[PDB]
Structure 1
Amino acid sequence: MAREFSLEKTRNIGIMAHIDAGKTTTTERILYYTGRIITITSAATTAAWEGHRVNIIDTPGHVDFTVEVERSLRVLDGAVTVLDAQSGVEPQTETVWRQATTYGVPRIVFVNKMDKLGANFEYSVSTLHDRLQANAAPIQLPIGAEDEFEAIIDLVEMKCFKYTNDLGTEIEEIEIPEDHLDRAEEARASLIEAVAETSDELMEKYLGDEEISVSELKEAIRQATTNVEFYPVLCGTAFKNKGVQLMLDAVIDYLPSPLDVKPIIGHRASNPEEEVIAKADDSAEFAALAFKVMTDPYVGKLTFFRVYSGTMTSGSYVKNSTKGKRERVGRLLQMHANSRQEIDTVYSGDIAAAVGLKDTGTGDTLCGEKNDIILESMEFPEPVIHLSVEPKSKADQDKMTQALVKLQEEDPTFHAHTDEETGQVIIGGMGELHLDILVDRMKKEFNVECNVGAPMVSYRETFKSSAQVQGKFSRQSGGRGQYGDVHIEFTPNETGAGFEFENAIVGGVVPREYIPSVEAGLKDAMENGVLAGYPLIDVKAKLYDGSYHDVDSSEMAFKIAASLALKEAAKKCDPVILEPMMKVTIEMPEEYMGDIMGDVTSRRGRVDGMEPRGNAQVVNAYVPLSEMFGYATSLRSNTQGRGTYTMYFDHYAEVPKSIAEDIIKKNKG
């Protein structure tokens, strides 16, 4: 009938932070407080605070699970960035901050673990300023640190709250103590200056020396936050129930609504150039984005989606404009702190789960049947680690493929592909932890035990020396007689130029009919390796002479002659083995550049160059693909998880003596 909460009162937020900063503690406390006048499961949880609907999505911290952060920030409106008080901004805090910035998500910072030894609110704020380059300012001050932390001075209202116990109840609203009054007023002045740096009206009002009103300053903070120009910084300890109510109040006061947020742009299916703005309007057409897909053992497949524009009732038909099909929305569910409730309708700015959607993956658009809009999808990072995977028992390869399909539908960042050359299946993930979890889930949930290893590297061969050679095959002894004879100069071609066949035949010594057959024989013979079984590349074959018989000559005979010519050229030209070389571009802070270049040179690669980029550095190098195995872990260890890289095949290079001999021995036996 009528939505229990209005767009102006709806809040979609996400708790993001570094590992073990207190995301799940904070979320559990939030759910408990909203649910009083707690198990955290599902993509999102709906609660109510002060007559406001609050949908909360708790995100993972590990760089291996950045897909969850990405797909949550895509559909979320605001974020709470949780910081460990003792350490402030950490590498994954920076990563989630950059993702939220790329999605233009307003954020409020929350300094958790104030009671922990070494807690330093000022140092956490300084880390916000330095590491992130963020216009963050405190809107609260902690009275006491570590075990002494016992009150919080709200600065918008210059009011102190004293917490008498760890239970989160019996908070005393008192006036700021005199000894902290000066510090509180200085913090308020700093906050006002920070907001005025974005607001010109507020700036003039403050320069006029007139007293700023509580309502005016709240409005200003809300405007700056919704513009993603100001970050309010709060403090507390979720474990001991201090500051959580203030944090929820700030979520309500400062984080935007689906109205305050910027609109969403999509493409008509039939008019991709056409642009459609989907504002938060119940009366408008229904368009929603499916951001998560899971399976619940009780109710079946759940598709968690965020509705941007329109409304949709359970037990109806919608369009999946990305798959261009029709989906039956049978049931609609919302997950609460303690229970799932079936809900008859969903309005703009609501996150819900559908029961009954088949063939609807994350990133799909669900639009009204008549409509054909397609909302903007999500971009996820490319794989950073690759492992050849294979079932321990070949009888389970079908189960393995089906599990890989289901797992790729569940997780966008996990990929699986077959390599033609090697005939191996490779799995790409975000890290070692990601791939390890996926292997274990395949082993247990899907009951497919698999073993993983470093992907095989497809090597190539070439001729280092030039030589004229001849091949002559005679098979006249028995029955039909076959004669072939060719004289070919084999030359090391310029690297990367490929095989080049030239026909310097004069006088028709080799009938023109058989020359294409000679070329085909050379191609086959070079496809088959001449030193270790790998294809031969970068060779110029110049067929300059030959002989033939008016009858015995045949295409197969000339192919045999070409094969013997390539065999004697491999004997006479000193073939080498080539290995793929990857162009590797590494980005990291300058303070780890020496470590990265040392590791590059230790990988038998060479540093091509360096160059500044933004506030960081970029290193360009060429490294063997074999030596690039497991490079993401080493880079993250060298850079404290701050380093990133990309790699692409660049060219082939000669394998060193010992490595080539080892390859050869392995291939022979």
Structure 2
Amino acid sequence: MSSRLEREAARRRTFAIISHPDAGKTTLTEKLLLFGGAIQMAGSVKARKAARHATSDWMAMERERGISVTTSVMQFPYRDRVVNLLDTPGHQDFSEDTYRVLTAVDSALVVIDAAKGVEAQTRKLMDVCRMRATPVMTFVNKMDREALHPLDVMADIEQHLQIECAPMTWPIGMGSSFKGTYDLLHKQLHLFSAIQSGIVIHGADDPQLDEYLGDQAEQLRMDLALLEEAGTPFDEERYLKGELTPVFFGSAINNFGVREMLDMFVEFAPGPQPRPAATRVVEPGEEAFTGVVFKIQARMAFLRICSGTFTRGMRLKHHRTGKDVTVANATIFMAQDRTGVEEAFPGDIIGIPNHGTIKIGDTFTESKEVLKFVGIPNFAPEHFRRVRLKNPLKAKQLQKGLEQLAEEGAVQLFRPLVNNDYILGAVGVLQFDVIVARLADEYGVDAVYEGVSTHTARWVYCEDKKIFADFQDYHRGELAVDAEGALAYLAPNPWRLESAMERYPKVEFRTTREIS
């Protein structure tokens, strides 16, 4: 029946966490790792957390490359599945890279702070998942602090993440009155105390509820009947379509409620899925190795394995340059206690060292066939700046530098139609600081920034050749070309954009565009 590869490939579970800041992603991640026996990685995740708020000597330690790479892809075994959890940079580090990580996961898990509910970064990231039709599992965290009512929390999720909510575990009480969770499908009761085997409940009439929950038993029975009416039973097919999301309540800090969520994930989360290419749809089943670059770092290119098997001694062909590339000493991301020939299977991540001459989306194969993976885009930035050059004779240099950095994708570049200025857009503002320093160290250029009216950008496309031309004349003042030669409308804010948009309903204004 199944092949060695098709099995190995299917044990994979590749996901990232989409969360707003301070929700507990780091805490939950460390918790997940401990379940996978990933003792050391878990240490690293914890050590880094600690080092942020530590003395100066550590801040200088966490900010280094060696570590932010080890924890960038964290793999651990769980219930014989190989879970590949990809770090999604947040806080100060939030950038386009975060979105790109979402272009490499078969699925995602949402983590919500119960007190805050759905916040801005949660919505933003979910926005990405929706367009790529990526199934999501939801974990409502921090039930030990006072929080929103669970029904309120679902309502919040449903409204703002535009998806149905299927609760799997329900919380009894909250804050100081947090007793634990009742797992609806398994008819088990999990008490919070200072993991543990749960208690079987037979019917909602079980006196055990009274025994363990006391006067709070009434609320669970109260809540459960409400649920069994306006309730969405987890439906596997609907989850995969993205229409529905399983919800879990817990206290990551206390390693509570996590087990159930982890189990749901290994059992039902998607394994490596087919990937589109220009010529055809690559299947993870195929023996021939294929991979797609989704992240780059200053040089190493992280690659998601799309089909086949990766080993050190193998030879890969870089299609864009047409070159032949060596992976002799790559980075294979794998759980500690390796114990096997060193190989990677579809859904895994590998770090190919390659100097320059790469882009986001580049395809590497084993065979002599032309193949080009598609669908990893650039995302419209929220933040813009105009780059000013102090010494005008260095203009040829800045131009090289910026064009090269954008090809590499450290930032997005916009050249207005009515002037010679450079406007940089960034998914997160940190990118601007990175760009300045790199421009100096790699290109010998001191560049400054200046503020601009612009807060919004959309890529414009129109079928009616006359209308599009008329439009381009009217909004000559707001148009720009990006590094990839694409036409972009720049607006001061989303509202001002609608004025333009309602005037030209026949012009499309996209928030993404494919790379070449």
TM-score, normalised relative to structure 2: 0.72
Cα separation, partners in 2 of 1:581 and 1:95, compared to 1, 3 Å: closer
Match of 1:287 among 281, 285, 290: 290
Confirm or deny that 1:186 pairs with 2:183.
no
- SS of 1:256's equivalent in the other structure is coil
Match of 1:39 among 23, 41, 44: 44
| Residue in 1 that maps onto 2:200 | 175
Cα separation, partners in 2 of 1:645 and 1:350, compared to 1, 3 Å: closer
Cα separation, partners in 2 of 1:587 and 1:387, compared to 1, 3 Å: closer
Alignment of 1:60-459 (within 5 A): 60-61=89-90, 65=94, 67-165=96-194, 169=195, 171-176=196-201, 177-178=209-210, 179=217, 182-183=221-222, 185-186=224-225, 189-190=228-229, 194-195=232-233, 221-258=235-272, 261=273, 263-268=274-279, 276-281=280-285, 283-295=286-298, 301-335=299-333, 344-356=342-354, 359-390=357-388, 404=402, 407-411=405-409, 414-416=411-413, 423-430=420-427, 432=429, 434-436=431-433, 438-439=435-436, 449-454=446-451
Cα separation, partners in 2 of 1:387 and 1:235, compared to 1, 3 Å: same
- SS of 1:194's equivalent in the other structure is coil
Looking at structure 1, the residues matched to 26 and 335 of structure 2 have their Cα atoms a distance apart, in angstroms, of 13
Looking at structure 2, the residues matched to 449 and 342 of structure 1 have their Cα atoms a distance apart, in angstroms, of 50
Alignment of 1:501-650 (within 5 A): 580=477
More off after superposition, 70-79 vs 52-61:
52-61
**Per-residue Cα deviation, 1:353-406 (whole angstroms, up to 9, x for no partner):** 223576232211111231211111412224454433245677987875665456
Tell me which amino acid in the other structure corresponds to 1:290. Answer: V
Looking at structure 2, the residues matched to 581 and 305 of structure 1 have their Cα atoms a distance apart, in angstroms, of 36
Give the number of the structure with larger relative contact order, counting CA–CA contacts within 8 Å between residues 6 or more apart.
2
Looking at structure 2, the residues matched to 435 and 645 of structure 1 have their Cα atoms a distance apart, in angstroms, of 24
Structure 1 residue 242 displacement after superposition: 1.4
Whether contact under 8 Å (1:16, 1:58) holds in the other structure is no
Looking at structure 2, the residues matched to 313 and 336 of structure 1 have their Cα atoms a distance apart, in angstroms, of 13
- SS of 2:377's equivalent in the other structure is coil
Whether contact under 8 Å (1:585, 1:620) holds in the other structure is no
**Per-residue Cα deviation, 1:489-528 (whole angstroms, up to 9, x for no partner):** xxxxxxx99xxxxxxxxxxxxxxxxxxxxxxxxxxxxxxx
**Larger fraction in strand:** 1
- SS of 1:75's equivalent in the other structure is coil
- SS of 1:326's equivalent in the other structure is strand
Tell me which amino acid in the other structure corresponds to 1:89. Answer: V
| Residue in 2 that maps onto 1:22 | 24
Structure 1 residue 143 displacement after superposition: 1.9
More off after superposition, 398-407 vs 361-370:
398-407
**Per-residue Cα deviation, 1:129-187 (whole angstroms, up to 9, x for no partner):** 2223311121111123123324121111010112322xxx4x24123524256247436
Whether contact under 8 Å (2:100, 2:295) holds in the other structure is yes
More off after superposition, 318-327 vs 175-184:
175-184
More off after superposition, 22-31 vs 63-72:
63-72
Looking at structure 2, the residues matched to 62 and 440 of structure 1 have their Cα atoms a distance apart, in angstroms, of 20
Structure 1 residue 51 displacement after superposition: 1.6
Looking at structure 1, the residues matched to 129 and 339 of structure 2 have their Cα atoms a distance apart, in angstroms, of 30
Q: How many residues align?
A: 438
TM-score, normalised relative to structure 1: 0.57
Tell me which amino acid in the other structure corresponds to 2:260. Answer: L
Whether contact under 8 Å (1:114, 1:120) holds in the other structure is no
Q: Find the structure with the greater CA-based Rg.
A: 1
Looking at structure 1, the residues matched to 258 and 443 of structure 2 have their Cα atoms a distance apart, in angstroms, of 40
Looking at structure 2, the residues matched to 381 and 36 of structure 1 have their Cα atoms a distance apart, in angstroms, of 33
Looking at structure 2, the residues matched to 4 and 444 of structure 1 have their Cα atoms a distance apart, in angstroms, of 46
- SS of 2:293's equivalent in the other structure is strand
Whether contact under 8 Å (1:32, 1:337) holds in the other structure is no
Looking at structure 2, the residues matched to 421 and 125 of structure 1 have their Cα atoms a distance apart, in angstroms, of 49
Looking at structure 1, the residues matched to 241 and 167 of structure 2 have their Cα atoms a distance apart, in angstroms, of 17
Whether contact under 8 Å (1:85, 1:124) holds in the other structure is yes
Looking at structure 1, the residues matched to 185 and 340 of structure 2 have their Cα atoms a distance apart, in angstroms, of 40
Whether contact under 8 Å (2:139, 2:248) holds in the other structure is yes
Cα separation, partners in 2 of 1:224 and 1:190, compared to 1, 3 Å: farther
Cα separation, partners in 2 of 1:338 and 1:13, compared to 1, 3 Å: same
Structure 1 residue 323 displacement after superposition: 3.5
Structure 1 residue 234 displacement after superposition: 0.7
- SS of 2:127's equivalent in the other structure is helix
Whether contact under 8 Å (2:178, 2:192) holds in the other structure is no
- SS of 1:35's equivalent in the other structure is coil
